[PDB]
Design a protein around this ligand. Structure first.
Ligand code: SAH
Ligand code: 1SH
Length: 429
């Protein structure tokens, strides 16, 4: 039971990709006439619009700059052969670089990983076109906000995808989902770190970090970059009354965050799947940007920092904790760990240099490695002590990997290879 706010959000999603352009040809697949007309009225005279009410009518659409598909796939999401026909027809109808905005409510789909599985399905599909393939490049998955605020529904999704040419090479997103942040990896991490957290020290430590923002007020807006399974965002909202928007590139991670907020219900918290280095955030809109033990994953720190600066309100504050590299002689074992994780580590000097260049003022940096060491020791006595309860849930292979990993990090700290760094700063004015 949606409202016109939904169609406006669908068009905003389109403009994340096409920016100031008005699309010349738009197709709309939407079986409900009122929603379809609401979408049509969003466009002006520079746009020609074609609409249909069933997917087989997509055969009549071509050369589209954008295809908006709204609540049309109830059958397809339960039937791969029908879904394949749709993806095929969608790809044929779009120009190369054309944008698909797909809205589908998954709240009546009991399977909680459905959003993630659909995203992977779209990302993998290939169609022969000419002497190569075409397929969809991933941009984002957003929640329909009307559904959160009016219907307590966090599982109403909008995919933003773009048609691209492909050869006949694993993505960053797929690397995260297939290696470090598999479902079993995620839940094994949560077990050691603490409920809802994938970061050192769990709830108590995250609260201590949040306090280093200084005074925060109810209703202020926070962007959480690399929100994981949501514990930090949920805590910022529940403890300080912040409105928190969390983003993560991993669908495995966000599937958990989304399942949990949909069940528990807190309208202060919303989530999006996207790459925080690419995604179009509203400029000058956030009071705070928080990133907890995420950015060691991100190579282009300069780009990230400029994007953070852009998204902050003047006077707003950024606070980040991250794995970093120390000043000791690097061991081959640490280097293999770094290479296998694909971490792009920096030291505090480097972070401060980048923050100054970006234009941040009031820069604070801290080497929190001694606290990191305490946390690793406490965490390890816990896995070692609760071995029997762990083995009831996960494999022996998973268990030994946690024990050996924590042992290893302790030695990496000892050589001053592995550091745990803090950075905060403010946008001028
Ligand atoms: N470029 C990027 N954009 C968005 N998220 C990213 C990212 N690079 C890494 N990540 C995410 O950063 C997360 C790090 S795990 C820590 C999660 C959470 N902040 C916590 O405190 O519990 C991972 O889920 C990973 O997917
Ligand atoms: C977010 N940090 C998660 C743990 O990563 P690891 O310490 O296993 O390299």
């Amino acid at each position: 039971a949606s409202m016109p706010a939904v169609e406006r959000q669908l068009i905003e999603c389109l403009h994340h990709v096409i920016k100031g352009a008005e699309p010349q040809q738009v197709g709309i697949l939407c079986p409900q006439d009122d929603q379809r007309k609401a979408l049509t009225e969003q466009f002006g005279s520079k746009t020609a619009t074609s609409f249909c009410k069933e997917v087989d009518s997509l055969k009549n659409l071509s050369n589209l700059d954008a295809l908006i598909v709204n609540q049309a796939l109830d059958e397809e999401i339960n039937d791969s052969e029908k879904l394949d026909k749709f993806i095929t027809a969608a790809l044929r109808s779009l120009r190369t670089d054309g944008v698909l905005i797909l809205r589908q409510d998954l709240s009546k789909v009991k399977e909680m990983k459905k959003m993630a599985m659909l995203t992977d399905y779209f990302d993998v599909f290939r169609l022969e076109e000419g002497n190569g393939n075409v397929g969809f490049q991933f941009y984002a998955v957003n929640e329909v906000l009307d559904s959160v605020y009016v219907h307590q529904n966090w599982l109403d999704f909008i995919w933003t995808l773009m048609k691209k040419p492909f050869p006949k090479v694993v993505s960053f997103r797929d690397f995260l989902d297939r290696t470090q942040y598999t479902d079993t990896g995620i839940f094994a991490y949560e077990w050691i770190f603490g409920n809802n957290f994938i970061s050192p020290g769990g709830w108590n430590q995250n609260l201590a970090i949040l306090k280093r923002f200084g005074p925060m007020k109810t209703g202020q807006r926070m962007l959480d970059i690399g929100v994981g399974i949501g514990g930090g965002a949920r805590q910022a909202a529940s403890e300080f009354g912040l409105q928190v928007h969390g983003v993560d590139l991993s669908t495995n991670m966000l599937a958990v965050a989304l399942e949990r907020v949909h069940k528990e219900k807190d309208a202060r918290v919303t989530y999006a799947v996207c790459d925080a280095c690419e995604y179009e955030f509203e400029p000058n809109s956030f009071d705070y940007v928080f990133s907890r033990d995420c950015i060691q994953h991100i190579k282009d720190t300069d780009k990230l920092f400029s994007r953070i600066y852009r998204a902050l309100k003047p006077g707003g504050k950024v606070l980040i904790t991250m794995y970093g590299v120390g000043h000791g002689t690097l061991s081959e074992s640490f280097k293999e760990y770094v290479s296998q994780r694909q971490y792009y580590l920096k030291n505090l000097e480097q972070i401060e240099e980048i923050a100054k260049k970006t234009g941040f003022i009031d820069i604070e940096v801290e080497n929190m490695t001694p606290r990191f060491k305490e946390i690793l020791l406490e965490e390890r006595e816990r896995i070692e002590q609760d071995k029997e309860t762990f083995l009831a849930k996960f494999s022996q292979n998973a268990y030994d990997g946690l024990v050996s990993g924590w042992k290893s990090k302790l030695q990496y700290i000892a050589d001053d290879n592995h550091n745990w760094n803090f950075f905060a700063a403010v946008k001028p004015q």
